[PDB]
Symmetry: D2
Amino acid sequence: TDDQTRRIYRDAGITVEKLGEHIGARVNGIELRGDLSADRVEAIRLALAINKVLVFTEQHHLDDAGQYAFARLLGEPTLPHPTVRSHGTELLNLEGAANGWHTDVTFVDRIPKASVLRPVTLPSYGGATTWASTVAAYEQLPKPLRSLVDDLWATHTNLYDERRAAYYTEFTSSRYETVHPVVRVHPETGERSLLLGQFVKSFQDLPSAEFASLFQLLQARITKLENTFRWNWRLGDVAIWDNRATQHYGIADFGEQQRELHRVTLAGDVPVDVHGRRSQILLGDASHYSGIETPQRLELF
Amino acid sequence: TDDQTRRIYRDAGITVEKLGEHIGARVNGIELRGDLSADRVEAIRLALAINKVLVFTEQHHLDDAGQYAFARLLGEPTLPHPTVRSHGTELLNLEGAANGWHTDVTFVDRIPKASVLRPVTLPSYGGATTWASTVAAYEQLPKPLRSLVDDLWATHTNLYDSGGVSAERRAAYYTEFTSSRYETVHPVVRVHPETGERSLLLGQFVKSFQDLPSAEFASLFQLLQARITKLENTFRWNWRLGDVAIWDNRATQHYGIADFGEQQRELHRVTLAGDVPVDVHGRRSQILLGDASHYSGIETPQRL
Amino acid sequence: MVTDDQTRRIYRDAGITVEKLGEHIGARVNGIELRGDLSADRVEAIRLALAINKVLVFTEQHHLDDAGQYAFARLLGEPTLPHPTVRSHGTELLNLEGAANGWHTDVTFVDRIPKASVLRPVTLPSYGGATTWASTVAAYEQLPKPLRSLVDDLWATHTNLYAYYTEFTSSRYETVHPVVRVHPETGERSLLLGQFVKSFQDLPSAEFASLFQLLQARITKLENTFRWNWRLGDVAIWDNRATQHYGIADFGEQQRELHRVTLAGDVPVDVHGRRSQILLGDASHYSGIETPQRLELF
Amino acid sequence: TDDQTRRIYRDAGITVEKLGEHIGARVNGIELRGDLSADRVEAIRLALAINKVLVFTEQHHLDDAGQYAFARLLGEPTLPHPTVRSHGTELLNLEGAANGWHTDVTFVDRIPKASVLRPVTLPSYGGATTWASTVAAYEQLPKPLRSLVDDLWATHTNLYAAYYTEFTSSRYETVHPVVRVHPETGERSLLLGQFVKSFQDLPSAEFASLFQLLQARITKLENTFRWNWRLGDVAIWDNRATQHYGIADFGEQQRELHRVTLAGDVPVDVHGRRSQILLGDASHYSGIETPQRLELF
Ligand SMILES: [Fe+3]
Ligand SMILES: [Fe+3]
Ligand SMILES: [Fe+3]
Ligand SMILES: [Fe+3]
């Protein structure tokens, strides 16, 4: 199947170079625009599915409008955030560093499927983003731990644990609780993926004392360095990641300097466990944030 | 089912009173001797299967010879210990307190099925023994954790990690205890061959979990042990001379409490031969190091 | 902190015997009927026995009803309300039903943690239902240097937000207590933790669970515990500044009812004399703040 | 003292660019050789002390001999390893990836003070090295945790296929303080890592929990510098102030780097107490260095 993949890349006039065994690839030979032909878009789609995070360089032509137009080719853009309104209405303007391991917006039923990210303002040092493959983490589980997580369910919430305070106030202006399976089946690749991250509050049918120990054990397996791709930002860079197969972490190692990146996120579907059972909403309505995408299986998977 | 149990107790002339919801019962109406009739032995076997730990009182007639003779009615006695030779030849003479949660001799393939214990010397206060039901702990697991343990395997070893016994004498004992090395891979969930009940097999002889790294071992071991030793699952007995305890070593852990200062405490134990554990799929434990055939036979169990 | 010849003289003079039931905790007291008209010297002998042994049990106290238990408890301190928030389960005594199966020190979510409780059974199941206590003084004594250095500097937020639970949490209490308190009457250092603890000051949530579990395991180590099988006529008294306890729910669906009187305490102080701090709530209706008297034996 | 630092770098003709807040800097303007003048050597020493890990690039002139000769300017080179003899006699020839967080050779009394590392063979992707600042980790502890580690001691051992047999051919056990005071900077640094077997006066059950807690504070991403290797790169790190980890994310490809380590001294705790040897003799591996305080600290 590998040769078929390279042929698809070739025909689309792109090159895709692996940057890590389990995650990360650099794409060259293409300028991201809203008028990319369908075949090239699908080549990017395939590269993303396989490699989980893609980086593009020298995209100096991109502005907010151009980034938005390109992102629309891969899916239906969500509102910037379900609760945060003060940092953009079309794109999400992330300031500082998102330094906690997470999958984006897992506290709603319709977890977004992907994000497109480009830097706007960068510090003189530090400030990398790192991603972890939750697909590799599942693959690496021994049988008894697989038996555990296949049956495990978790409640996700936006009420997670001067300006930083104000932001949290807006972030939690309305309360969301969603019960998701800890193992979801990727609707386009069929791969099993761990669904956890910092929005997780509890595990169904388990006491609080056991939550912390098991959460820690599973997160450490996800964020194991061998499963991670860490990217040093330069102006002109663009990252695309599969939010159904990763967690990420923005590193706050740049002191008091300003750091700004602009994000477009694409609507996803409701997670299903290994038996095909869907997540359940306890609190909140995310219909104003995005629709529910109808996913399509990739025929190579 | 309970009518049948009541008739068996009645025919044997005993009463069996529950002392806790999940574990422990006191038996009255019988003097433990080597010549007990078969109906009474059957009744004790059934009471033990149901209640996991039995205590008998005012058995002042019992000495070492009598305890051994009674114990042989319940099964075939093992040697006092697989490696310890200096602390009894017919019975194991336990001194101080065995203050760590354990199932007896889980580091061999043939885990002994049961123990008979009587006090010889007791402190003026403290020194209770407490037992936990590993059957109840399994029953109380939520679905995902049960799925975990059903597939989990663990290596048990005799190289494991006060009570009026000197530090020096404890050293000599540990040296003898570990004079030869045993390693056995047991399932964390075993199926009781006589009751069919599932029970957790863990305890302080466990060194590692199969296919899991060391860091994850400590966290999961602690989690499962805390579920086993949860107070609701435990029966704690204050010893008096004349008492006798019998426990199902396939369905319990126990712990002798060192809360009596520098006072002396001595109890004498007889263990009965058991069989090799099987997991919920019928797969047997695997020996890595050691041979326990000098210590005990392998019992052929009978479903009750 | 020991039973010396002076202690024995005090017991003798008061006509009681005090039998140790465990190395670190628990004693049975004989020779006395708990009543509201006990002479001052016999009351002070009980106070001393309690300080030393942390939990006392008395037996064959069949003369006692709620009124009598309250009248006796009054000799040891100022009875609090049954509870800061729970009003529907007693007006003078707290009527505990079922089992309080979580390790705790009573009412640690207020500033004025009650100093002691007097407990007697009213209804008992045919098996099970023991109460067990742990010595938080012994737990501190047994810490090695690095862990003692940790806890001496550690502070924790306690809260009542752990039909009954609705009433229990009808008003919200949060109090920051030191993890190590200095007992105001004995001078002994004691761990102050238990299930009302929500967080540690200056520590993130992940580290909270690990450290809390670690410290609780040292407190509830079997060697530090006294477990009592109740009989009708028994009475227990415990030092709520020096213990935690746990009611065991191992009696199936049977009824279990014990009646409690709690006595007013003071605000904890750390090893530097700094007092706990109130974040939310006012407990002035529950009790006043007791002015303790240090025992001249400690 | 930032004016003094900027002046020392300038006077020695180097630039030192921070690559992370707590750790990592790139040094330019200098070719690493055995004949560097003393003032340029001291500028690198200061840069290393401050930034904990230095990287130099395009050092294509360097071979094993040149790397050795340069390293000699910073200290006394040790044997390649206390027990491993078949993988280099002057330099240590590291193959594969050292994927466990560790401080180098902490199981001896004389923990080496620094290492100089250069790649020889690199995989087509992956294979980065990441370092963590154990100084930053100490700085970030709240009071109660600081009170804990200041009094905590740990036993380190080398008993952590043919290679493992040689690595463990002789047994070393050393009891080190978990907090050491850096003899040249005065900074307090956590001393832990994968060679730690146990904590003094603490039971095994508490060991795993506290070890995991402290290591997580050390390897927290904000405290780490992760470097993608290219031929011609050279890294120098302060082994008294860091841990490191070679990432095994390059499949079955070949990866080889050559190391020179420099002799260190015996750790001291915050009360001036030195580590204690339980088993082993490292006198063949290196001598004990007499350190010098930097007058900038
Ligand atoms: Fe994010
Ligand atoms: Fe035993
Ligand atoms: Fe209580
Ligand atoms: Fe290394």
